[PDB]
Amino acid sequence: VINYVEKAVNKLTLQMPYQLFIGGEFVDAEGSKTYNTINPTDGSVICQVSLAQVSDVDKAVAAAKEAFENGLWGKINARDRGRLLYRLADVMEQHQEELATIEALDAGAVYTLALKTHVGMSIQTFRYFAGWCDKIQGATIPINQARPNRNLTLTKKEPVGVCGIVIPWNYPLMMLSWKTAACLAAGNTVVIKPAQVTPLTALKFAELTLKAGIPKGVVNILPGSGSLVGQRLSDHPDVRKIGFTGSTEVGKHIMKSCALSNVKKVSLELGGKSPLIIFADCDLNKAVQMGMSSVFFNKGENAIAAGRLFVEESIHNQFVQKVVEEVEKMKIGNPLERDTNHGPQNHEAHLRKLVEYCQRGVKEGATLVCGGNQVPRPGFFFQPTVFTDVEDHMYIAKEESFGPIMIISRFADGDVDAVLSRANATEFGLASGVFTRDINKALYVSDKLQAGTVFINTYNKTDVAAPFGGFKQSGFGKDLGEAALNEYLRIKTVTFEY
Amino acid sequence: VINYVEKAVNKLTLQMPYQLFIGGEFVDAEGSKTYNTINPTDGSVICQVSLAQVSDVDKAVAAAKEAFENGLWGKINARDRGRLLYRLADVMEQHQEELATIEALDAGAVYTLALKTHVGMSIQTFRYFAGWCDKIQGATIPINQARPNRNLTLTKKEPVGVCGIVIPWNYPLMMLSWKTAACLAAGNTVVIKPAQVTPLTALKFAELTLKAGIPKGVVNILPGSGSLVGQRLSDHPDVRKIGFTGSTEVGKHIMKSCALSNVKKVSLELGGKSPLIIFADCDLNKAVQMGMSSVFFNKGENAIAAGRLFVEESIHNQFVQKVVEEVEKMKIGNPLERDTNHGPQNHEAHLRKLVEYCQRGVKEGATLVCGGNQVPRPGFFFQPTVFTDVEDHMYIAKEESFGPIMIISRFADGDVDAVLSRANATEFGLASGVFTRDINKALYVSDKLQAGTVFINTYNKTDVAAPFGGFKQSGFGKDLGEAALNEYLRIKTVTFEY
Amino acid sequence: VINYVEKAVNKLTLQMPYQLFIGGEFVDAEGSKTYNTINPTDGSVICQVSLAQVSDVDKAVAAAKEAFENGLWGKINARDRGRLLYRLADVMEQHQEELATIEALDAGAVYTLALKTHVGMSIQTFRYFAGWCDKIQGATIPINQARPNRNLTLTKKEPVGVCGIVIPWNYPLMMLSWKTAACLAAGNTVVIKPAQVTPLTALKFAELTLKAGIPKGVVNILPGSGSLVGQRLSDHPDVRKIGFTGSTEVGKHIMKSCALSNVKKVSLELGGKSPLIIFADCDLNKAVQMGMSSVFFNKGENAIAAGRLFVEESIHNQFVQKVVEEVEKMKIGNPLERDTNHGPQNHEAHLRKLVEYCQRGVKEGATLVCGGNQVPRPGFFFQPTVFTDVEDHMYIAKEESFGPIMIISRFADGDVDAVLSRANATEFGLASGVFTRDINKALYVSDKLQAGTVFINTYNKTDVAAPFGGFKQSGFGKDLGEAALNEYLRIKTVTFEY
Amino acid sequence: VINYVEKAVNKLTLQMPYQLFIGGEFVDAEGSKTYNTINPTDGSVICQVSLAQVSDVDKAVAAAKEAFENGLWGKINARDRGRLLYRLADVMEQHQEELATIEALDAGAVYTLALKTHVGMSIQTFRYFAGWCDKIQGATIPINQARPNRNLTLTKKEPVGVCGIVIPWNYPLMMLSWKTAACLAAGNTVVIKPAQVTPLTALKFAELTLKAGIPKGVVNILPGSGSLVGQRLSDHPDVRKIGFTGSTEVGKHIMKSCALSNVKKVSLELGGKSPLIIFADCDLNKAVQMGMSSVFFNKGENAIAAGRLFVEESIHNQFVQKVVEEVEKMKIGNPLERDTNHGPQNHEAHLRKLVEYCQRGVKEGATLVCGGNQVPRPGFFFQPTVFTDVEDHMYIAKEESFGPIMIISRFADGDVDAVLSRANATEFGLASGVFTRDINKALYVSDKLQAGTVFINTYNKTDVAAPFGGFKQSGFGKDLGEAALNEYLRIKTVTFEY
Ligand SMILES: NC(=O)C1=CN([C@@H]2O[C@H](COP(=O)(O)OP(=O)(O)OC[C@H]3O[C@@H](n4cnc5c(N)ncnc54)[C@H](OP(=O)(O)O)[C@@H]3O)[C@@H](O)[C@H]2O)C=CC1
Fold first, then answer.
1. Same domain for B326 and B403
2. Could you give the C-alpha distances from C19 to A472, C27, C38, in angstroms and in order?
3. For this protein, what reaction is catalysed (chains A, B, C, D)?
4. What angle do CA D255, D256, D258 make, to 5 degrees?
């Protein structure tokens, strides 16, 4: 039997585990240390959660190692590994309302969105990658023959072994799922560190692995801080790969730590300052709707959020006019209320940063059209924000807000290369977008944009089959798609002479 | 006119450039600094070579960046890029005797071997990767449709941009060729740092890129030190990828340097301590020939050299007898003598390391069966060496010699898993081999060996089409094969709604 | 409400549809015509089954065409098509005992074997291909650019459209599943003709498509004759692809009919006379076990069954002795009885053919070591048979028995190429096998065998992920694996200029 | 020493072989039979050409078989096969002017076009496929393991063996090259039947295979009739694959002949009635240029020629006015003259057919806007022709002309689905095209068009890397791209247990 924090809310009875998940059981951290997880709708403590220590990390890694080297996960058929991951997805589907509610409490995710995206996409992720298990294939290669003898060369795709996954707080379950699904589908075992501020759906997910029959030690979950738990994972001599999603500066440190220990492999999904270029020949009403969504989706807590909108001179003023109209219709409120469409920010420290971000925007001369402030109510709500007259030298033109802040610049009618240059003048390169009805402009702009994803007449259209990752200082490696598997596999070349 | 060091040798008049190669021109380093490159056959100075400074690195990177962004290389068809790389191979083949002679002089490479391997495989590498240019393909992906609308998702494979390549001294031209061919085939431009002790074939190669019509600035070559030139490449804000081959310790530092600058991509080909397991049911005389080659090839200066031979008890002593008989037949001498089997070690400091390595093996209790010291003669020759009674705890059982030192341990008759455990008990993982006539042992042992390459009934059988790279602390990423391309390409996902 | 033939057998109540399945409903054939399906255990009539006429084929094709062009199947996401096929697999697994019992009745498949293979592999087939749906991907291709303009070239994989599947009687459900799973995963719709003598699992499968929610018209099943129903499918102007498994002579006629109508695509899985070469250095007892299995599995009604065994001279007599010892232990009986090893042949005409086959073998001078005759008991049982002293000119050396008849020839000790020549001297090339502990022989022999599958130290080891198809007159195209999809897809190239 | 027909023309000396090419030597046909090849510029006889008989086919097939089974071609490394084909491409380039001049003489190809396309693309084809040789790769597949044992499954890509290639006359050398390059790159040997009316570049190409060092027997060339030589290739028991390009009716017969002999593999590139849909939002001047090119390229003797132009109501008359203006500017004349941009039709029978075809268009009520007649000069020149008021039921709306005949229909403004239906109402499906600046219409139309190639804002843009083939009665299988290799390879599955 497992200890839960029980909570009657959203017409359900939530049963939330709150302990470390190690070697297939929920256990207290070393010394029974704990910390509070905060509900962002009202600032209250949801419950106490175990706080992993170094010795807990070592225990998690040991369990992962044993499960890989000697446990059932390392022995079963790829096909049957796949069956287990499908079953895991089914179990997650059976708990989708409960998971979405926990995500609503823990991260302020609007329930209807959490159900469709945070949770729904997590389910798709496990089903998608389950299908890959018995379709991961190596090669036979026609090398030169050592005459009078013959040669056969083949490759085998093998798991990398024990992995660490370190994720952020914006979509707690979904970021976990993206990376964990690829990791497990490739035959690895894993120690996962959720963002300290959002441990709850991870811990519930841990319980669901038990229900699905995932062998003990294959999935291990350690709520705790990056500087302690995350750091130890990156240092550990038995971890052979880190999968990381978070800020560029922590990414740099993680990669450094991978190097200095045992050259463990690393993938990095880092920040974004993603440009959206809106031409006069677009469908303007659709540009407003998709433009809205590109910034405000998931309260702007979205690595690929459009961080600059460049709007062609002749439609700029009309675009801003319509954006303001639509911004005014947004209902701000409790994520559990069905009419809510803008929930609170994830946690307090992030709310503070958003306040400062907008102060600086105003200080440096941008026009604040609306918002920019904490909403006066309990919790950590932030008013949807629109800036105009944003110039390329400005802080808010360079730096990622990760909040609901639309940052608008003009470009002259008929300029294409000039706006492209401005769009590309960033060390980020995670995503980008273009709205235009012109085929030639769409294709040309998408060649020239220096970003891992280019959206054309849409935005935020991610898919579990479509690889997702950055260029330049947005990192390297893919989540999602066939390409994701490559971060979690190694290639062995086997060459015979006969 | 290019300045040459001219040398009448080996029936040829070598014309050897000696300066930095930047933006299509041979130029002195800052302050006209130079250093000596040393002939390992007699310890004489071959000539002075420009010694790149930081400002020279910055110039080379600036030339590479301009060549990629605005030069011809970034505009031509993939197919036409292929034609240029094929033509480069042709030029290399037209100069193959000269390149092999230069390699004999600079690296102590035995001339017959240098023709066939150092130079011959370099030519194969360019031809092979030339064929890939117009066959690098992205995907179209059946994502979920945003009904009532439609979606098209495709991927585009793009170059990474400016690359730095840092290589070692054991096969100067060939290591350059492996990485550079893949790098250029993928459409990138490059700054190459050859090992300071072996700049000459790299500089001759630079001139050949001119004869081949490779556009100015696509290839830049900077002889100089790792800690100065190599460091600046890893730190440089406009370099987007480092391809590295060398020691594990420098590899760690390189990766750290990529992290701390701009999270540039990195691939690491690091040390080996590769195990060769020889069973009693093998063809013994063949095992002796291949066993010897697995150690002594290219005077042991070979990252995949078998660093331990595990020989089944019942054949051990006969195996050692035959090896000693064969070792006595090896002709040691000048790399230009056509009957030379064994040339000098690459440079003086390495010879001294090899003397110390062998003193240490004796001191810790291994049996010196033959060799173990510098051959008394001018230059830097080391005796082919055989150690027996080697035990798992010993320094020479753990550490990579990178010299012609056969390190033999028995294993028990009819044991398989126990020898595998010993073979795997290393943080290296670059290569390995197994000699056996038994199909079941061969397949099982190749599954279980923790190494990027497993040779079966052969050794050193690399091939331009067969991917080559390590596991664990031997690094990550592949040179050669289709797989090598992936270190030099990025994936852009382009998603339409219509 | 569906009409069933109800039968209480095997501790179950079977509910067997017996009508045509067209447009999602069970309906009588034109003029309510029927025929008898015969239980091979006792010769009794199981029930009457609808006998499809030309007008019924036309109705089924029309239903398939509507379902493809206007129905849901053609509109849903590839991912959701996948979900439906995974649901179909679950439904099949929920009914596995029932399906295996029906197959035991209809085909004489030993129940324990039918659970694991006839039905078990069918279930695996749908799960496997279900995973392919959203992972079938086109390409983006780096074509030459019409400078000063640009080009993008991509490929789209599209369904072929309406398909006909015509299958034999040896594994009724499994052969249907192999082809139908791939066909449907590629987004096609289908009309299936089971072998007239074995319609029952096909019809039950049809009902399971309803339970799984496969849209109406996607699957249509027509019990009936090849020369009427199969022929009309091949001739139909709206059918775009025929998938055929059966005899070489019918296969010729099918290909010819695809030609003369509308050059519909065709794939052909035809006969076999597969050689199994057993060397003296094999594991003898293992060779006996697998040798027997290679012939007797599924009462020899197995297209890849070893049709000749070549046994090295020095182990031949001992091999024959051991086979005879093991043959005597086989338990012949009712397929529903748990101790049964060897069930009845599929139908009477086939039994008659096997009797004649063995009469001819004795007549032409081969040594009948055992069997050769109908077992004295009700139904259509045939004694496991062993022939020795078979010479290459004999009829039984050339002709496919498709029954439990082991046909043994000797080869001289050491005579590798000579035995290969003998093994390849056939216009068939479906499968082949070699038993040897010698890696060099195994690799060499497998290069030289002219067959689509080579087994090494095993036999009948098929897998839903491993492609299966013949060379020469055994046909072309694959069932199973990624390769099977290509038969059911078309490639559209799309080339933009911008 | 080879016998040539020598001719001083176009500033060079042609040296044209005129005999059969068998087993690496030029030889007379049985009974020294010959026939005349006719120059379409003046109706004169170029020379006499050997006329292959049945026994010549058998000799060619036997040479091909021997070259495959025992000659060097079946023994050399894949890489070295690649070198030979790249050398063949070089030799072709060295003879580019001569080949293009022969093509002008024999087929009426305008010399400047022949140099760039007929010959230029042929050279690209061999270079492209040469690069594939050592990059053709099989798989290793994670099949279910027969516990407590292990399984390894790999696939080997092998040559099919002796192939027959039968080609049409519209681009003699280029059709030969497309198919032959893919065939040889895959390791096969081949017997080629050029169109009887166009043997000369094929025979010169045969001579170039000697200069390139292609082993004797690998390439064999048989000028002669389809009904005799082609038929025997389809029937031959030793031919294992036919590659065919030509009319639908002959394709049907070829496929039938493949079936009835030995189920040899077959690919079919058949007729087209390719629709080009021009929207009012296109760049009209560019649409006129590309539209004209879509019809008139290579005097309309082009399988992918737009056989039907649908032009949006509002631009229709202006489009027709502009086409007529541009047609008046075309220079009709000797293909060797540099100002010629419209050469003669390929042969006399085809000119007649075009004359009759246009009579029929006029008779059935289509408006003949210009052309329709033979040009009053020597040879077989036909006027660039434009029809308007073409109705869907008309013969000329349904039948492929294969000549320079633009066939125009209107469609209503804003119709999209209606025009698509009309464009898709054909049993052909080889190519298609759409001109529009609207991204949404372009993507949607290319989804809906039922053809193997869709051009968007261009036409005739084929590329050696882009697969080319038809849907429906336009056939199946690809020429060009990676996909083309699949017609010329077989997959062998090899499964070990250990
Ligand atoms: N899809 C594609 O890639 C292409 C298709 N084509 C198509 O070809 C047609 C125009 O050429 P056309 O001359 O009419 O084509 P045909 O089908 O009449 O001839 C093509 C080739 O087939 C040969 N042939 C004829 N009968 C037989 C037979 N019984 N067995 C074997 N071979 C035979 C011909 O020989 P012979 O010399 O005696 O006539 C010729 O070499 C058009 O429909 C066009 O669309 C053309 C080019 C490319």
1. yes
2. 64, 6, 16
3. (6R)-10-formyltetrahydrofolate + NADP(+) + H2O = (6S)-5,6,7,8-tetrahydrofolate + CO2 + NADPH + H(+)
4. 65
Resolution of the experimental model, in Å, one decimal: 2.3
Same domain, D344 and D480: no
Can you give the C-alpha Rg of chain A in angstroms? 24
A496 and C152: CB-CB below 8 Å? no
And the tokens for A167? 């994720």
Residues C401 and C363 in one domain: yes
A10 burial via Cβ count (<10 Å: 0-12, 13-18, 19+): middle
Sheet with B475-476: strands ordered across: B25-27, B20-22, B219-221, B189-193, B162-166, B241-245, B265-269, B475-476
**CATH at D185:** 3.40.605.10
Chain C residues with CB under 8 Å of A498 CB are 439-440, 443-444
A1 is a domain residue: no
Exposed / middle / buried, residue B32 (Cβ in 10 Å: 0-12, 13-18, 19+) = exposed
D272 touches D240 (CB < 8 A): no
Distances (CA, A) of A448 to C144, D204, D364, D458: 18, 46, 52, 22
Give the distance between the most distant pair of CA atoms in chain B. Answer: 84
- Exposed / middle / buried, residue B148 (Cβ in 10 Å: 0-12, 13-18, 19+): exposed
Would the CB atoms of B253 and A259 count as touching at under 8 Å? Answer: yes
Co-location of B180 and B42 in the same domain: yes
Structure tokens at A401: 């807000």
* Rg, Å, chain B Cα set: 24
Among D85, D90, D443, D454, the strongest candidate for a mutation testing the B interface, having the largest count of B CBs within 10 A, is D443
Closest atom of ligand 1 relative to the D303 alpha carbon: 45
Structural domain of C232: 6-271+464-498
Residue C387 in contact with partner chain D when CB distance is under 8 A: no
Distance CA C91, CA C83 (A): 12
CA-to-CA distance for A360 and D442, rounded, in angstroms?
Answer: 45
Residue C1 falls inside a structural domain? no
Between CA A182 and CA A180 the distance in angstroms is 6
Q: Which amino acid is at D317?
A: N
Find tokens 């099919």 and name the residue.
D160
Neighbours of C419 (CB within 10 A): 24
The token pair at D284 is: 């009209």
Q: CA B261, CA B266: separation in Å to the nearest integer?
A: 12
Domain of residue C400, CATH code: 3.40.309.10
What's the rounded Cα separation, in Å, for the pair C18 and C34?
9
The set of residues, in sequence order, having a beta carbon less than 8 Å from that of B88 and lying 6+ positions away, is B126, B130, B208, B209, B212, B214
- DSSP letter at B470? -
- Bridge partners (DSSP) listed for residue D17: D4
Number of domains present in the structure of chain A: 2
Pairwise CB contact (< 8 Å): A268 & B263 = yes
Q: How far apart are CA C189 and CA C209, in angstroms?
A: 13
Distance between CA atoms of D142 and A489, rounded to whole angstroms?
A: 14
- Do both B391 and B470 map to the same domain? no
D406 lies in the same domain as D262: no
CA atoms within 13 A on the CB side of C275: 28
Same domain, A277 and A397: yes
For residue D153, give the DSSP letter.
Answer: E
Cβ partners under 8 Å of residue A1, min gap 6: none
Give B426's strand partners.
Answer: none
Distance of alpha carbon A52 from alpha carbon A226, whole angstroms:
10
State whether residue C433 sits within 8 Å of chain D by CB.
Answer: no
Expt. technique: X-ray
Question: Does residue B192 sit within a domain?
Answer: yes
Report d(CA B436, CA D498) in Å as an integer.
14
User: DSSP H helical segments within B401-474, as ranges?
Assistant: 417-424, 439-448
Please tell me the distance from the alpha carbon of residue C455 to that of residue C457, in angstroms, as a whole number.
Answer: 6
Cα(A478)–Cα(A469) distance, integer angstroms:
5
Q: Tokens at residue C418, please? A: 């000579």
In this structure, the answer to whether residues B323 and B414 fall within a common structural domain is yes
